[PDB]
Protein backbone atom coordinates (compact mmCIF):
# COMPACT_ATOMS: atom_id res chain seq x y z
CA UNK A 1 0.00 0.00 0.00
CA UNK A 2 2.70 2.55 1.05
CA UNK A 3 6.54 2.77 0.98
CA UNK A 4 9.48 5.09 1.82
CA UNK A 5 12.62 4.55 -0.27
CA UNK A 6 16.05 6.27 -0.55
CA UNK A 7 18.15 6.21 -3.76
CA UNK A 8 21.90 7.01 -3.56
CA UNK A 9 24.38 7.60 -6.42
CA UNK A 10 28.14 7.95 -5.83
CA UNK A 11 30.21 8.75 -8.94
CA UNK A 12 34.00 8.97 -9.35
CA UNK A 13 35.36 11.53 -11.86
CA UNK A 14 39.21 11.31 -12.07
CA UNK A 15 40.54 14.79 -12.88
CA UNK A 16 37.06 16.43 -12.90
CA UNK A 17 37.15 16.96 -9.10
CA UNK A 18 36.09 15.07 -5.95
CA UNK A 19 33.53 12.20 -6.40
CA UNK A 20 29.89 13.36 -6.70
CA UNK A 21 27.24 12.08 -4.22
CA UNK A 22 23.51 12.40 -5.01
CA UNK A 23 20.86 11.35 -2.44
CA UNK A 24 17.12 11.35 -3.19
CA UNK A 25 14.11 10.28 -1.07
CA UNK A 26 10.61 9.11 -2.10
CA UNK A 27 7.23 8.42 -0.42
CA UNK A 28 5.66 6.01 -2.99
CA UNK A 29 6.00 7.89 -6.35
CA UNK A 30 6.36 11.36 -4.71
CA UNK A 31 9.93 12.71 -4.20
CA UNK A 32 10.37 14.81 -1.03
CA UNK A 33 14.14 15.31 -0.42
CA UNK A 34 17.22 15.95 -2.60
CA UNK A 35 20.97 16.35 -1.92
CA UNK A 36 23.77 17.11 -4.37
CA UNK A 37 27.35 17.41 -3.09
CA UNK A 38 28.25 19.43 -6.28
CA UNK A 39 26.57 22.59 -4.77
CA UNK A 40 28.66 25.52 -3.27
CA UNK A 41 27.47 24.77 0.30
CA UNK A 42 25.59 21.45 -0.17
CA UNK A 43 22.23 21.27 1.66
CA UNK A 44 19.17 18.97 1.76
CA UNK A 45 16.31 20.57 -0.22
CA UNK A 46 12.54 19.82 0.06
CA UNK A 47 10.81 18.51 -3.13
CA UNK A 48 7.25 18.18 -1.68
CA UNK A 49 5.01 20.80 0.11
CA UNK A 50 4.16 18.54 3.13
CA UNK A 51 7.91 18.23 4.04
CA UNK A 52 8.52 22.06 4.23
CA UNK A 53 6.62 21.99 7.61
CA UNK A 54 9.68 20.13 9.11
CA UNK A 55 11.88 22.14 11.51
CA UNK A 56 15.60 23.01 11.03
CA UNK A 57 16.67 20.14 13.42
CA UNK A 58 15.47 17.75 10.64
CA UNK A 59 17.18 19.75 7.84
CA UNK A 60 20.61 20.05 9.56
CA UNK A 61 20.41 16.26 10.35
CA UNK A 62 19.71 15.14 6.72
CA UNK A 63 22.58 17.45 5.59
CA UNK A 64 24.87 15.85 8.27
CA UNK A 65 24.00 12.25 7.14
CA UNK A 66 24.39 13.01 3.39
CA UNK A 67 27.64 15.06 3.94
CA UNK A 68 29.04 12.03 5.89
CA UNK A 69 27.88 9.60 3.12
CA UNK A 70 29.68 11.81 0.50
CA UNK A 71 32.99 11.12 2.37
CA UNK A 72 32.13 7.39 2.96
CA UNK A 73 31.36 6.85 -0.76
CA UNK A 74 34.65 8.55 -1.87
CA UNK A 75 36.49 5.88 0.19
CA UNK A 76 34.06 3.12 -1.02
CA UNK A 77 34.60 4.04 -4.75
CA UNK A 78 38.41 4.02 -4.15
CA UNK A 79 38.31 0.63 -2.30
CA UNK A 80 36.05 -1.20 -4.84
CA UNK A 81 38.42 -0.03 -7.64
CA UNK A 82 41.26 -1.81 -5.77
CA UNK A 83 39.15 -4.99 -5.31
CA UNK A 84 38.39 -5.20 -9.08
CA UNK A 85 42.05 -4.13 -9.88
CA UNK A 86 40.61 -1.30 -12.06
CA UNK A 87 42.35 1.79 -13.49
CA UNK A 88 42.45 4.99 -11.35
CA UNK A 89 41.46 6.78 -14.64
CA UNK A 90 38.01 5.15 -15.11
CA UNK A 91 34.67 6.59 -13.87
CA UNK A 92 32.74 4.14 -11.64
CA UNK A 93 29.32 4.30 -9.90
CA UNK A 94 28.03 2.93 -6.56
CA UNK A 95 24.23 2.97 -6.20
CA UNK A 96 22.22 2.24 -3.06
CA UNK A 97 18.50 1.51 -2.83
CA UNK A 98 16.99 0.96 0.63
CA UNK A 99 13.59 1.36 2.28
CA UNK A 100 10.54 -0.06 4.05
CA UNK A 101 7.18 -1.25 2.64
CA UNK A 102 3.84 -1.04 4.51
CA UNK A 103 0.67 -3.05 3.90
CA UNK A 104 -2.92 -1.61 4.11
CA UNK A 105 -2.65 -2.75 7.78
CA UNK A 106 -0.10 0.05 8.41
CA UNK A 107 2.44 -2.51 9.72
CA UNK A 108 5.91 -3.26 8.24
CA UNK A 109 5.44 -5.63 5.29
CA UNK A 110 9.06 -5.74 3.97
CA UNK A 111 12.40 -4.01 4.68
CA UNK A 112 15.03 -3.88 1.91
CA UNK A 113 18.59 -2.68 1.07
CA UNK A 114 20.48 -3.24 -2.21
CA UNK A 115 23.86 -1.90 -3.42
CA UNK A 116 25.25 -1.95 -6.97
CA UNK A 117 28.62 -1.32 -8.64
CA UNK A 118 28.57 -0.01 -12.26
CA UNK A 119 24.92 -1.14 -12.71
CA UNK A 120 25.56 -4.71 -11.42
CA UNK A 121 24.16 -6.21 -8.14
CA UNK A 122 26.95 -6.04 -5.52
CA UNK A 123 25.76 -6.48 -1.88
CA UNK A 124 22.11 -7.05 -0.86
CA UNK A 125 20.44 -7.47 2.53
CA UNK A 126 18.66 -10.85 2.82
CA UNK A 127 14.87 -11.11 3.57
CA UNK A 128 15.71 -11.96 7.26
CA UNK A 129 17.54 -8.53 7.56
CA UNK A 130 20.45 -10.31 9.37
CA UNK A 131 22.73 -11.68 6.60
CA UNK A 132 24.29 -10.33 3.36
CA UNK A 133 24.15 -11.72 -0.19
CA UNK A 134 27.51 -10.86 -1.81
CA UNK A 135 27.35 -11.17 -5.64
CA UNK A 136 31.12 -11.97 -6.01
CA UNK A 137 34.50 -12.36 -4.13
CA UNK A 138 35.09 -8.55 -3.90
CA UNK A 139 31.59 -8.05 -2.37
CA UNK A 140 32.62 -10.55 0.39
CA UNK A 141 35.42 -8.11 1.48
CA UNK A 142 32.67 -5.42 1.90
CA UNK A 143 30.48 -8.03 3.75
CA UNK A 144 33.21 -8.88 6.32
CA UNK A 145 33.64 -5.12 7.07
CA UNK A 146 29.83 -4.66 7.32
CA UNK A 147 29.65 -7.71 9.68
CA UNK A 148 32.29 -6.22 12.08
CA UNK A 149 30.55 -2.77 11.84
CA UNK A 150 27.15 -4.46 12.71
CA UNK A 151 25.44 -2.80 9.64
CA UNK A 152 22.68 -5.51 9.32
CA UNK A 153 21.77 -5.14 13.06
CA UNK A 154 21.48 -1.30 13.06
CA UNK A 155 19.90 -1.33 9.54
CA UNK A 156 17.25 -3.96 10.56
CA UNK A 157 16.45 -1.83 13.68
CA UNK A 158 16.04 1.32 11.47
CA UNK A 159 13.91 -0.43 8.75
CA UNK A 160 11.59 -1.95 11.45
CA UNK A 161 11.40 1.27 13.53
CA UNK A 162 12.53 4.75 12.34
CA UNK A 163 11.81 4.01 8.59
CA UNK A 164 8.19 2.87 9.34
CA UNK A 165 7.78 5.67 11.99
CA UNK A 166 8.87 8.52 9.64
CA UNK A 167 6.89 7.03 6.67
CA UNK A 168 3.68 7.15 8.84
CA UNK A 169 4.46 10.81 9.78
CA UNK A 170 5.05 11.78 6.09
CA UNK A 171 1.80 9.94 5.12
CA UNK A 172 -0.22 11.88 7.76
CA UNK A 173 1.35 15.31 6.92
CA UNK A 174 0.71 14.70 3.20
CA UNK A 175 -2.60 12.74 3.58
CA UNK A 176 -4.29 15.02 0.96
CA UNK A 177 -1.78 14.34 -1.88
CA UNK A 178 -0.10 11.04 -0.78
CA UNK A 179 -3.12 8.98 0.46
CA UNK A 180 -5.56 10.30 -2.23
CA UNK A 181 -5.16 8.45 -5.58
CA UNK A 182 -5.80 10.60 -8.71
CA UNK A 183 -7.62 8.52 -11.40
CA UNK A 184 -6.57 8.83 -15.09
CA UNK A 185 -8.33 11.07 -17.63
CA UNK A 186 -9.11 8.75 -20.54
CA UNK A 187 -9.93 9.13 -24.28
CA UNK A 188 -9.16 7.18 -27.50
CA UNK A 189 -7.86 8.97 -30.67
CA UNK A 190 -8.07 7.83 -34.35
CA UNK A 191 -5.06 8.39 -36.68
CA UNK A 192 -5.30 6.99 -40.28
CA UNK A 193 -1.99 5.42 -41.45
CA UNK A 194 -3.31 3.96 -44.79
CA UNK A 195 -6.32 3.31 -47.12
CA UNK A 196 -7.70 0.61 -44.76
CA UNK A 197 -5.12 0.81 -41.87
CA UNK A 198 -5.61 3.15 -38.87
CA UNK A 199 -3.98 3.66 -35.43
CA UNK A 200 -6.14 3.76 -32.25
CA UNK A 201 -4.52 5.47 -29.24
CA UNK A 202 -5.83 4.95 -25.68
CA UNK A 203 -4.64 7.75 -23.37
CA UNK A 204 -4.18 7.51 -19.57
CA UNK A 205 -3.39 11.03 -18.31
CA UNK A 206 -2.84 12.86 -14.99
CA UNK A 207 -2.96 9.73 -12.80
CA UNK A 208 -1.28 9.05 -9.44
CA UNK A 209 0.27 6.61 -8.34
CA UNK A 210 2.41 5.50 -11.37
CA UNK A 211 1.10 1.86 -11.55
CA UNK A 212 -1.44 1.39 -14.40
CA UNK A 213 -2.60 -1.36 -16.82
CA UNK A 214 -3.66 -0.33 -20.38
CA UNK A 215 -4.85 -3.11 -22.73
CA UNK A 216 -6.47 -3.29 -26.20
CA UNK A 217 -9.11 -5.99 -26.76
CA UNK A 218 -10.25 -7.02 -30.28
CA UNK A 219 -13.83 -8.23 -29.47
CA UNK A 220 -12.68 -9.77 -26.12
CA UNK A 221 -9.07 -10.99 -26.71
CA UNK A 222 -5.74 -9.22 -25.89
CA UNK A 223 -3.26 -8.04 -28.62
CA UNK A 224 0.24 -8.13 -26.92
CA UNK A 225 1.80 -8.62 -30.46
CA UNK A 226 -0.04 -5.59 -31.98
CA UNK A 227 -0.44 -3.37 -28.84
CA UNK A 228 2.33 -0.76 -29.05
CA UNK A 229 2.61 0.05 -25.36
CA UNK A 230 4.48 3.20 -24.39
CA UNK A 231 6.55 3.37 -21.17
CA UNK A 232 4.84 5.23 -18.22
CA UNK A 233 6.16 8.82 -18.26
CA UNK A 234 6.08 11.58 -15.58
CA UNK A 235 3.91 14.57 -16.63
CA UNK A 236 6.28 16.80 -14.57
CA UNK A 237 3.58 18.08 -12.17
CA UNK A 238 3.72 14.98 -9.82
CA UNK A 239 1.24 13.04 -12.10
CA UNK A 240 1.89 10.33 -14.74
CA UNK A 241 0.84 9.48 -18.32
CA UNK A 242 0.81 6.40 -20.62
CA UNK A 243 -0.71 5.33 -23.96
CA UNK A 244 -1.63 2.07 -25.77
CA UNK A 245 -1.82 1.90 -29.60
CA UNK A 246 -3.13 -0.62 -32.18
CA UNK A 247 -3.01 -0.63 -36.01
CA UNK A 248 -6.52 -1.78 -37.06
CA UNK A 249 -8.39 -2.41 -40.38
CA UNK A 250 -10.69 0.54 -41.32
CA UNK A 251 -14.36 0.02 -40.38
CA UNK A 252 -13.52 -2.55 -37.65
CA UNK A 253 -12.36 0.22 -35.15
CA UNK A 254 -15.55 -0.21 -33.05
CA UNK A 255 -14.76 -3.88 -32.37
CA UNK A 256 -11.53 -2.71 -30.58
CA UNK A 257 -11.85 -1.71 -26.89
CA UNK A 258 -9.44 -0.18 -24.30
CA UNK A 259 -9.32 -1.38 -20.67
CA UNK A 260 -7.68 0.92 -18.07
CA UNK A 261 -6.83 -0.28 -14.51
CA UNK A 262 -5.91 2.16 -11.70
CA UNK A 263 -6.56 2.30 -7.91
CA UNK A 264 -8.12 5.78 -8.35
CA UNK A 265 -10.96 4.05 -10.29
CA UNK A 266 -13.70 2.19 -8.28
CA UNK A 267 -14.10 -0.44 -11.08
CA UNK A 268 -12.08 -1.02 -14.36
CA UNK A 269 -12.98 1.29 -17.27
CA UNK A 270 -13.83 0.57 -20.96
CA UNK A 271 -13.31 3.09 -23.84
CA UNK A 272 -13.89 2.83 -27.64
CA UNK A 273 -13.87 5.53 -30.43
CA UNK B 1 14.54 10.34 7.69
CA UNK B 2 17.48 8.46 6.07
CA UNK B 3 19.65 5.67 7.61
CA UNK B 4 22.09 7.19 10.15
CA UNK B 5 25.02 4.84 9.75
CA UNK B 6 27.67 5.47 7.09
CA UNK B 7 29.94 2.45 6.56
CA UNK B 8 32.88 2.19 4.13
CA UNK B 9 32.62 -0.69 1.61
Amino acid sequence: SHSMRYFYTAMSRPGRGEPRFIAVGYVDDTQFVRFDSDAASPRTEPRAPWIEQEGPEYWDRNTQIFKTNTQTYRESLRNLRGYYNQSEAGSHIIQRMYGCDLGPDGRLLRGHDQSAYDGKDYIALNEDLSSWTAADTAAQITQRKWEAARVAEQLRAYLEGLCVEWLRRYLENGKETLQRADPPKTHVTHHPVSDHEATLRCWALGFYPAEITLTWQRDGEDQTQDTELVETRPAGDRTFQKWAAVVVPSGEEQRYTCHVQHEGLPKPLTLRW
Amino acid sequence: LPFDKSTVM
Partner: T-cell receptor
Amino acid sequence: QSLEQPSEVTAVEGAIVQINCTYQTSGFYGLSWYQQHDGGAPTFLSYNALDGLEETGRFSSFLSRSDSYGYLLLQELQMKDSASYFCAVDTGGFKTIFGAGTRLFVKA
Amino acid sequence: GVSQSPRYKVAKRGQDVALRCDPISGHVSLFWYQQALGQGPEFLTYFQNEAQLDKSGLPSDRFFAERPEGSVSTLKIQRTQQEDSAVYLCASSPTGGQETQYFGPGTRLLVLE
Protein backbone atom coordinates in the same frame (compact mmCIF):
# COMPACT_ATOMS: atom_id res chain seq x y z
CA GLN C 1 19.86 13.17 25.09
CA SER C 2 21.45 11.65 28.25
CA LEU C 3 22.00 8.39 30.19
CA GLU C 4 22.16 7.31 33.88
CA GLN C 5 24.25 4.69 35.78
CA PRO C 6 25.19 4.16 39.52
CA SER C 7 28.29 5.95 40.88
CA GLU C 8 29.78 2.92 42.74
CA VAL C 9 29.26 -0.87 42.97
CA THR C 10 31.12 -3.33 45.27
CA ALA C 11 31.63 -7.11 44.99
CA VAL C 12 33.94 -9.86 46.35
CA GLU C 13 36.53 -11.90 44.34
CA GLY C 14 34.85 -14.79 42.47
CA ALA C 15 31.35 -13.23 42.71
CA ILE C 16 29.16 -11.71 39.93
CA VAL C 17 28.22 -8.02 39.66
CA GLN C 18 25.63 -6.01 37.69
CA ILE C 19 25.94 -2.43 36.39
CA ASN C 20 22.60 -0.94 35.21
CA CYS C 21 22.29 1.80 32.52
CA THR C 22 19.12 3.67 31.48
CA TYR C 23 19.26 5.94 28.42
CA GLN C 24 16.91 8.80 27.48
CA THR C 25 17.20 9.72 23.76
CA SER C 26 14.80 9.86 20.75
CA GLY C 27 16.74 7.77 18.18
CA PHE C 28 18.69 4.80 19.65
CA TYR C 29 21.16 3.01 17.32
CA GLY C 30 23.30 1.19 19.92
CA LEU C 31 24.32 0.68 23.59
CA SER C 32 28.02 -0.19 24.16
CA TRP C 33 30.19 -0.78 27.29
CA TYR C 34 33.78 0.33 28.07
CA GLN C 35 36.32 -0.54 30.84
CA GLN C 36 38.75 2.17 32.06
CA HIS C 37 41.60 1.80 34.62
CA ASP C 38 42.93 4.97 36.41
CA GLY C 39 44.92 6.97 33.81
CA GLY C 40 44.36 4.38 31.06
CA ALA C 41 42.66 3.85 27.68
CA PRO C 42 38.90 2.96 27.70
CA THR C 43 38.68 -0.58 26.24
CA PHE C 44 35.58 -2.01 24.48
CA LEU C 45 33.65 -4.84 26.20
CA SER C 46 30.34 -5.39 24.31
CA TYR C 47 27.82 -3.65 21.97
CA ASN C 48 24.01 -4.02 21.82
CA ALA C 49 22.11 -2.80 18.73
CA LEU C 50 19.13 -5.22 18.90
CA ASP C 51 17.40 -6.56 22.05
CA GLY C 52 19.00 -9.55 23.77
CA LEU C 53 22.24 -10.74 25.39
CA GLU C 54 25.81 -10.29 24.07
CA GLU C 55 28.42 -12.62 25.62
CA THR C 56 32.23 -12.16 25.50
CA GLY C 57 33.82 -14.50 28.06
CA ARG C 58 33.18 -13.23 31.62
CA PHE C 59 31.34 -10.13 30.24
CA SER C 60 27.71 -10.08 29.09
CA SER C 61 25.47 -7.12 28.25
CA PHE C 62 21.64 -7.08 28.10
CA LEU C 63 19.39 -4.60 26.22
CA SER C 64 15.67 -3.70 26.14
CA ARG C 65 14.82 -0.85 23.71
CA SER C 66 11.12 -0.67 24.78
CA ASP C 67 12.26 -0.01 28.40
CA SER C 68 15.37 2.01 27.25
CA TYR C 69 17.32 -0.24 29.68
CA GLY C 70 20.59 -2.17 29.46
CA TYR C 71 23.01 -3.76 31.92
CA LEU C 72 26.52 -5.24 32.12
CA LEU C 73 27.12 -8.49 34.01
CA LEU C 74 30.68 -9.57 34.97
CA GLN C 75 31.42 -13.19 36.01
CA GLU C 76 34.29 -14.69 38.15
CA LEU C 77 35.48 -11.33 39.57
CA GLN C 78 39.26 -10.84 39.61
CA MET C 79 41.28 -7.95 41.17
CA LYS C 80 42.08 -6.67 37.61
CA ASP C 81 38.29 -6.00 37.19
CA SER C 82 38.69 -3.00 39.58
CA ALA C 83 38.13 -0.10 37.14
CA SER C 84 35.49 2.38 35.88
CA TYR C 85 32.76 0.96 33.62
CA PHE C 86 31.00 3.21 31.13
CA CYS C 87 27.84 2.74 29.11
CA ALA C 88 27.69 4.61 25.79
CA VAL C 89 24.65 5.46 23.66
CA ASP C 90 24.82 5.89 19.85
CA THR C 91 21.91 7.89 18.38
CA GLY C 92 22.95 7.72 14.72
CA GLY C 93 25.89 9.42 13.02
CA PHE C 94 29.10 9.67 15.08
CA LYS C 95 28.44 11.65 18.34
CA THR C 96 28.64 9.14 21.24
CA ILE C 97 27.21 10.05 24.67
CA PHE C 98 29.05 8.42 27.61
CA GLY C 99 27.78 8.08 31.16
CA ALA C 100 29.46 9.39 34.33
CA GLY C 101 30.77 5.83 34.89
CA THR C 102 30.49 3.17 37.61
CA ARG C 103 33.53 2.52 39.80
CA LEU C 104 33.73 -1.19 40.73
CA PHE C 105 35.66 -2.23 43.87
CA VAL C 106 36.78 -5.89 43.90
CA LYS C 107 37.17 -7.06 47.53
CA ALA C 108 39.95 -9.68 47.84
CA GLY D 1 46.74 -0.20 19.09
CA VAL D 2 46.08 3.56 19.25
CA SER D 3 49.08 5.54 20.57
CA GLN D 4 48.98 9.11 22.01
CA SER D 5 51.69 11.62 23.04
CA PRO D 6 52.54 13.15 25.51
CA ARG D 7 51.24 10.93 28.39
CA TYR D 8 51.19 13.98 30.74
CA LYS D 9 51.55 17.73 30.08
CA VAL D 10 51.89 20.67 32.49
CA ALA D 11 51.53 24.14 30.91
CA LYS D 12 51.44 27.84 31.84
CA ARG D 13 48.40 30.11 31.11
CA GLY D 14 48.35 31.69 27.63
CA GLN D 15 50.88 29.18 26.21
CA ASP D 16 50.12 27.08 23.09
CA VAL D 17 49.91 23.26 23.46
CA ALA D 18 50.01 20.45 20.79
CA LEU D 19 48.52 16.93 21.39
CA ARG D 20 49.41 14.08 18.98
CA CYS D 21 47.29 10.94 18.24
CA ASP D 22 48.43 7.93 16.17
CA PRO D 23 45.37 5.71 15.43
CA ILE D 24 45.28 2.12 14.10
CA SER D 25 46.33 1.79 10.40
CA GLY D 26 43.36 1.69 8.02
CA HIS D 27 40.89 3.24 10.51
CA VAL D 28 38.76 5.67 8.45
CA SER D 29 37.01 7.17 11.55
CA LEU D 30 38.82 9.26 14.20
CA PHE D 31 37.40 10.89 17.36
CA TRP D 32 38.80 13.41 19.85
CA TYR D 33 37.32 13.43 23.40
CA GLN D 34 37.65 15.53 26.57
CA GLN D 35 37.45 13.70 29.93
CA ALA D 36 36.81 15.55 33.23
CA LEU D 37 37.47 13.98 36.69
CA GLY D 38 34.48 11.84 37.74
CA GLN D 39 32.97 11.98 34.21
CA GLY D 40 33.02 10.03 30.92
CA PRO D 41 34.55 11.12 27.57
CA GLU D 42 32.72 14.09 25.97
CA PHE D 43 32.80 14.41 22.12
CA LEU D 44 34.98 17.20 20.62
CA THR D 45 35.52 16.55 16.86
CA TYR D 46 34.99 13.77 14.23
CA PHE D 47 37.21 12.81 11.28
CA GLN D 48 36.50 10.52 8.33
CA ASN D 49 39.93 10.23 6.66
CA GLU D 50 41.28 13.84 6.26
CA ALA D 51 37.77 15.44 6.30
CA GLN D 52 36.73 16.99 9.66
CA LEU D 53 32.99 16.19 9.46
CA ASP D 54 32.11 17.87 12.82
CA LYS D 55 33.62 19.98 15.66
CA SER D 56 30.42 21.04 17.61
CA GLY D 57 31.86 19.53 20.82
CA LEU D 58 34.93 21.85 20.77
CA PRO D 59 34.77 24.52 23.54
CA SER D 60 36.48 27.50 21.78
CA ASP D 61 38.01 28.42 18.36
CA ARG D 62 41.38 28.30 20.29
CA PHE D 63 41.12 24.50 19.77
CA PHE D 64 42.32 23.35 16.33
CA ALA D 65 42.20 19.73 15.12
CA GLU D 66 43.94 18.48 11.97
CA ARG D 67 44.50 15.17 10.12
CA PRO D 68 46.07 16.32 6.75
CA GLU D 69 46.90 12.69 5.94
CA GLY D 70 44.01 10.48 7.12
CA SER D 71 46.25 8.76 9.69
CA VAL D 72 48.03 10.94 12.38
CA SER D 73 45.82 13.58 14.10
CA THR D 74 46.99 16.63 16.08
CA LEU D 75 45.00 18.89 18.44
CA LYS D 76 46.48 22.38 19.01
CA ILE D 77 45.12 24.44 21.95
CA GLN D 78 46.06 28.13 21.36
CA ARG D 79 46.34 30.33 24.55
CA THR D 80 45.62 27.71 27.31
CA GLN D 81 43.33 28.43 30.32
CA GLN D 82 42.76 26.50 33.63
CA GLU D 83 39.32 25.32 32.28
CA ASP D 84 41.22 23.41 29.49
CA SER D 85 42.73 21.05 32.16
CA ALA D 86 41.44 17.47 31.48
CA VAL D 87 42.45 14.13 29.87
CA TYR D 88 42.33 14.38 26.07
CA LEU D 89 41.46 10.96 24.66
CA CYS D 90 41.61 10.00 21.00
CA ALA D 91 39.66 7.06 19.51
CA SER D 92 39.30 5.33 16.13
CA SER D 93 36.83 3.06 14.28
CA PRO D 94 37.76 0.93 11.20
CA THR D 95 35.01 1.79 8.63
CA GLY D 96 32.72 4.56 10.02
CA GLY D 97 30.44 5.75 12.82
CA GLN D 98 28.25 3.76 15.31
CA GLU D 99 31.01 1.08 15.64
CA THR D 100 33.54 -0.31 18.18
CA GLN D 101 35.92 2.47 19.22
CA TYR D 102 39.64 1.92 19.87
CA PHE D 103 41.13 4.44 22.33
CA GLY D 104 44.59 5.85 23.05
CA PRO D 105 45.94 6.24 26.64
CA GLY D 106 45.19 9.98 26.43
CA THR D 107 47.08 13.16 27.36
CA ARG D 108 46.52 14.44 30.90
CA LEU D 109 46.70 18.23 30.48
CA LEU D 110 47.11 20.56 33.46
CA VAL D 111 47.09 24.32 32.87
CA LEU D 112 48.43 26.56 35.68
CA GLU D 113 48.91 30.34 36.34
